[PDB]
Design a protein around this ligand. Structure first.
Ligand SMILES: [Mg+2]
Ligand SMILES: [Mg+2]
Ligand SMILES: [Zn+2]
Ligand SMILES: [Zn+2]
Ligand SMILES: [Zn+2]
Ligand SMILES: [Zn+2]
Ligand SMILES: [Zn+2]
Ligand SMILES: [Zn+2]
Ligand SMILES: [Zn+2]
Ligand SMILES: [Zn+2]
Ligand SMILES: [Zn+2]
Ligand SMILES: [Zn+2]
Lengths: 512, 131, 512, 131
RNA sequence: UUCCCC
RNA sequence: GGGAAUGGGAUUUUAAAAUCCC
RNA sequence: UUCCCC
RNA sequence: GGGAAUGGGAUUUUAAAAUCCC
């Protein structure tokens, strides 16, 4: 049929509108139509006191305009901008008394964890202009929606609500991305609610810097980014993805529960937003690591990457001098390069599948503790950023703590986390039971290089042959501070270091 | 429930200009990129022997003009958004608007682009004889 | 005369029973009733094929018998057995098409996390006996119950369900308590389900030991405790408490969400059980620690207490000897017991909440970093088992990690945990953001006692006089091992030690 | 839905004995502690001229006895639990049981405590005479 | 007839 | 309260209907 | 509203 | 085409209705 529910008249008046007042041809009264046109009848005066509610349901954002960005994006662009993902859900209420036939936004929830309750407000048609005003409404007729019953008396005016939305989005995303991606399940009512707080147009620039404009103010027609959006009320040019359009059957919870167990509490807007983002992250990221997609630097990724390599070199160089194992096993190394080339030890490499390394010396190993307990009975093992069920008692382990959230460590699926440094690594949930056979590694600095020279260093953790005397030179006094900062940065990023229980510093004091 | 008031062919542009900061610019950019104009306007039937003024209380079109209902030729009344008028009132609504026959394909765009002459009461460049 | 819904005849047969087959005077048909009595009509035969479902809803367990313990205990008594608390929730299905008017257990859930699905089974009065048999049933109407539709095709026989229940209860509770306390929200259907797997009687003893009998076996007519209940099929003499009787209004989710944000996902039996036990824990323990109630020493509590005492003494002595603070603030300790009496430092003592003593011995201190950061700039602050939002940069802190669950640490409310060591202490959720001004305390030993005195010690962390030589004497060599065992036990129990960032052991080495 | 069977005054003792491992011992202990007997049994209106046998197919009450329906004098039929018989069947259901009028206030307890002589069919100690 | 959303 | 959808092909007869197969 | 049978 | 069913309880008000819990 040649009708749509967009801009539907929900008023209870049995008659239509006058030809000089009806917005469309389907809105004019039947008494005026004649042979497909409308004829002015002096006997029917136009109405000057009517109020007609207009439905904002049924938007179609499929415009193709030359200088305008498109709101809906492809899945590859969403994978690129995963740092900007904010789940979004809306729970609504039904217009009841003076108008029936539309739903109004009641509780808007985001994956950040907030719920904003708004006064039921609609767009009514008056003889002068469309008026944005409060309308009578009732909660949906269902037991599942009974928790929405109090919220009808707890809403805020939309002027407050949209300013709070802009504040929350800017405070969440200003150190992560230059845009917002809304992760939706069903976009119809989400778009109907976005009509209340989202405006679009050509791409712009912030009024105080060179960043992309993300917010618009109607008090003064100015555009700003996340950093300069204080007092701004509208979201300008957002992006969105609909997850249900990825071939899903059933509802949101039935699909989320197949892959995750730490989120629940359906029909709450924030909880469903978290569920939507979790399902999207699972569908786009928990398969394998993709090195064809690269992410921009937003912080201390370079320092973390340097500090990890520095610690990995120093710990292994100290361990191979402490007890002098004749052979070691390196497990989980993507490429066949030993951490310390100068070591006089037999390196044997094992991995499930290397990162396309030409050196095929790496043996196949799909490790499991109950299966490979007798594989590495002798010699020190290395597990650097390798995630297994349990480590043996003779290992040196670096493990990332998924419970440490930061700009690099986004929330993940089923208790895991999405670590985005240069690529996106999905890490399963941290378990301390995997470290029952090990102990936490202490901090220490070690070097054998010759040295030549504001308080001088006074610490028992500087294991150097220079420190055997009563003083230490300035070269090691600076390099120890550099390694201390590197170790602090590495442990603050979320990395935990574990060593075998027999490890101690005294043997290192015997290396001189 | 309710009465449907819009045709599906208008679903795209009306969804566009409703979200746009500047609906008048958005409509012109939509037209300039190959989009079709707004349909489903109310068209009046008359003897075409009127005065020819731009906006009138009664249909008063000339021989080369067609009268439309004023609410259907205002873009903001179609998109149900804020009028940029000084008090938010509409000048077309409650009146009948005269569109030239050659421009009758896009009556919304004609009302957006063109203006009226305050001392003669008809469209500038499209029939006003004072210039 | 009034009637009760217990043992209601749910069968769809319109007539009553024969006077020789009716169990009560209400069951006999109106043919035979006369003048308040019954008549034997010679011609009427008795039915020999009827199958009358009997309703098990409406049990009242308010008996008072001398040798028989009561199932429903008071909350003052349940607080003393919090280590036996197991939340319990049942979902149900409606009998249909052969009997209407009763509900049968479908999904049984417990706070341990398990869900057990049973085939719909009922009690059917037959002309020979009562037959415990599978009956027709349907899931309840309503959207919220639609997830119960798949459970009708995956139930287990009840003889297996109660074996699994006994196994799970014994595995959970054999190292915690000598009984079970079921934490319920509505005890009606809970009792109706307990009819299927619970037996009562006088107090008994285990068949293989002198412990309280908690399980019964019909295959051998024997009683057992949690340790010896292999193959037992009934729970014998359990206890229970109804939380909704404590004055709550509304549903369980509404009251639970007022205090906790961790649990959700209502209408799944295990999740509802977890919510019920969480609400009970909040109502009993989040208020304040009750020192009047003591708990039995289940295991290793005295060793952990001695280890904590030794570690605290050593670290405070080492810090005071190394850095020589003028004032030490023993924050959160109402007692003026100095862990090192001979230290050349003055001591101040505070309490988080006002105690019963009105003397001027201690001062009030509700510490928060936003209000008390600059009040203790000089000296050192001893935050031993005191929980604050953020610690200052001059502190020695011992903090319990609530994510390390054990027999002494039970799950609590809103992410916290209930630690039971001679008393019940509810501790808020652990966050690593409270230690941004501190660093992890290294493991070390210090000796200040005289060195008057089998493998020689070769560790460099033993800060003692005899370590500056060929070998450590066997007195300190075994005392260091004892302290290492104490440290490992303490940090395995869940205690984390933090110190101000400028702590170094080298200042101790200059003491000799 | 459904037809009620029991009165509220039996709610406790029937809930107790339906949970016990030994329902006869439980009922005896409930009575010993001042509890009240199970009521709402099915008593017959008869001529009281019968042979006086303990269990019959017809109400055969002697002048010193009262006749009841059997299923109402069985604790296991009253609590809807398993019978302790090896076959699991009831000896009282489908029959009439004659209880002495001195012990007629608690017929359920009487049928538990007593037994029937085989050679005469009388309650032992109540109308039985074989020694 | 069926599904999704509220 | 809002909304969507009801597969593919062949043959015959007068775009539609019927039949048949998947 | 849902199911069974044809 | 034929047929069946739509759970349990508490409270209040005037058998019925409403509210609340499961
Ligand atoms: Mg939702
Ligand atoms: Mg439940
Ligand atoms: Zn800016
Ligand atoms: Zn999830
Ligand atoms: Zn040096
Ligand atoms: Zn207008
Ligand atoms: Zn003019
Ligand atoms: Zn035992
Ligand atoms: Zn909780
Ligand atoms: Zn010594
Ligand atoms: Zn019986
Ligand atoms: Zn005899």
């Amino acid at each position: 049929e040649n009708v749509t529910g967009l801009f539907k008249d929900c008023s209870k008046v049995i008659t239509g509108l006058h030809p000089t007042q009806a917005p469309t041809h389907l809105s004019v009264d039947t008494k005026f139509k004649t042979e497909g046109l409308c004829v002015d009848i002096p006997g029917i005066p136009k109405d000057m006191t009517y109020r007609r509610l207009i439905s904002m349901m049924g938007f179609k954002m499929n415009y193709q305009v030359n200088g305008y960005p498109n709101m809906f994006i492809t899945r590859e662009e969403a994978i690129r901008h995963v740092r900007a993902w904010i789940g979004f859900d809306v729970e609504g209420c039904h217009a009841t008394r003076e108008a029936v036939g539309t739903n109004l936004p009641l509780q808007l929830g985001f994956s950040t964890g907030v719920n904003l309750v708004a006064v039921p407000t609609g767009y009514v048609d008056t003889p002068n202009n469309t008026d944005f005003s409060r309308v009578s409404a009732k909660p949906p007729p269902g037991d599942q929606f009974k928790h929405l019953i109090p919220l009808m008396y707890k809403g805020l005016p939309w002027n407050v609500v949209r300013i709070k939305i802009v504040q929350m989005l800017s405070d969440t995303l200003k150190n992560l991305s230059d845009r917002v991606v809304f992760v939706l399940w069903a976009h119809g009512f989400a778009l109907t609610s976005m009509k209340y707080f989202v405006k679009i147009g050509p791409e712009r620039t912030c009024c105080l810097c060179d960043r992309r404009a993300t917010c618009f103010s109607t008090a003064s027609d100015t555009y700003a980014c996340w950093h300069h959006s204080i007092g701004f009320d509208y979201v300008y040019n957002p992006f969105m993805i609909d997850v249900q359009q990825w071939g899903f059957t059933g509802n949101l919870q039935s699909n989320h529960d197949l892959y995750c167990q730490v989120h629940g509490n359906a029909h709450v807007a924030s909880c469903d937003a978290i569920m939507t983002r979790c399902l999207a992250v699972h569908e786009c990221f928990v398969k394998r690591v993709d090195w064809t997609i690269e992410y921009p630097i937003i912080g201390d990724e370079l320092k973390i990457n340097a500090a990890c390599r520095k610690v990995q070199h120093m710990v292994v160089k100290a361990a191979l001098l402490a007890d002098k194992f004749p052979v070691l096993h390196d497990i989980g190394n993507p490429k066949a390069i030993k951490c310390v080339p100068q070591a006089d030890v037999e390196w044997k490499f094992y991995d499930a599948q290397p990162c396309s390394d030409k050196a095929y010396k790496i043996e196949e190993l799909f490790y499991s503790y109950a299966t490979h307990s007798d594989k590495f009975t002798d010699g020190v093992c290395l597990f650097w950023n390798c995630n297994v069920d349990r480590y043996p008692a003779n290992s040196i382990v670096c493990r990332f703590d998924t419970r440490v959230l930061s700009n690099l460590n986004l929330p993940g699926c089923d208790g895991g986390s999405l670590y985005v440094n240069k690529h996106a690594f999905h890490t399963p949930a941290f378990d301390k039971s995997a470290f029952v056979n090990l102990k936490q590694l202490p901090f220490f600095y070690y070097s054998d290089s010759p040295c030549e020279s504001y308080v001088p260093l006074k610490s028992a953790t500087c294991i150097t042959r220079c420190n055997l005397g009563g003083a230490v030179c300035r070269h090691h006094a600076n390099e120890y501070r550099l390694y201390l900062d590197a170790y602090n940065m590495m442990i603050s990023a979320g990395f935990s270091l574990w060593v075998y229980k027999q490890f101690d510093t005294y043997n290192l004091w015997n290396t001189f | 429930a309710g009465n449907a008031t819009e045709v599906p062919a208008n679903s795209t542009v009306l969804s566009f200009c409703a979200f746009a900061v500047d609906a008048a610019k958005a409509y012109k950019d939509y037209l300039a990129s190959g989009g079709q104009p707004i349909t489903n306007c109310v068209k009046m039937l008359c003897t075409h022997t009127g005065t020819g003024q731009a906006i009138t209380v009664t249909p008063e079109a000339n021989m080369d003009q067609e009268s439309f209902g004023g609410a259907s030729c205002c873009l903001y009344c179609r998109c149900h958004i804020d009028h940029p008028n000084p008090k938010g009132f509409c000048d077309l609504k409650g009146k009948y608007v005269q569109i030239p026959t050659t421009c009758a394909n896009d009556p919304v765009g004609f009302t957006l682009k063109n203006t009226v002459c305050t001392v003669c009461g008809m469209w500038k460049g499209y029939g006003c004889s004072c210039d």
